[model samples]
Target: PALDSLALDLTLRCGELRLTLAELRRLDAGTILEVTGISPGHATLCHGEQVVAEGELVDVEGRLGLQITRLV
Candidate 1:
């Protein structure tokens, strides 16, 4: 395989929460939704259903950022 000049759009999966239609409709301003997993402030970067790496969530000048910690 040629391994050069390849680009990829990796997705960072922080966490997931299951919600029903009624629950989703109840969302309003200032509402807080609790998300499970990644409680240690870490996120998993994935390519579709395959996980590629893990990282810590960070704030970069008021913007959300990810600090890669390890490659899977």
Candidate 2:
């Protein structure tokens, strides 16, 4: 089967950041951690370690969501 004709099942993932042990231990209710690189309204979609798409982050009826703008 050709690549274009094959159906690919993919799981989209948002970007990730690391936290130190102290920071992880400090997490509590209402504690806000600032994630750099990805801001509100923008996100990077990934499959495993490879990035597959980029999109805008949106709120869908109080639920977090992504609106894909580009595919790679």
Scored by TM-score, the top model is 1
Model 1: per-residue lDDT, tens digit, 3-72?
Answer: 6767878898978899999988998999878888778678999998788998999999999898989989
lDDT of each: 0.87, 0.76
Write out the backbone clash pairs for model 1.
none
| Model 2 misplacement above 4 A | 2-14, 59-65
Error of 2 at 70 (Å): 1.4
Best by lDDT: 1
* Local accuracy of candidate 2 as per-residue lDDT tens digits, 1-72: 578887656554544578999989888999776766666668877766777888988889999888999988
Worst 10 residues of 1 by lDDT: 1-10
Going through the candidates in the order shown, the clash numbers are: 0, 0
Q: Give model 2's TM-score versus the native structure.
A: 0.63
lDDT of 1 at 71: 88
**TM-score for all predictions?**
0.71, 0.63
Relative to the unseen true structure, what is the C-alpha lDDT of residue 42 in candidate 1, on a scale of 0 to 100? 85
Structural RMSD, model 2: 3.2
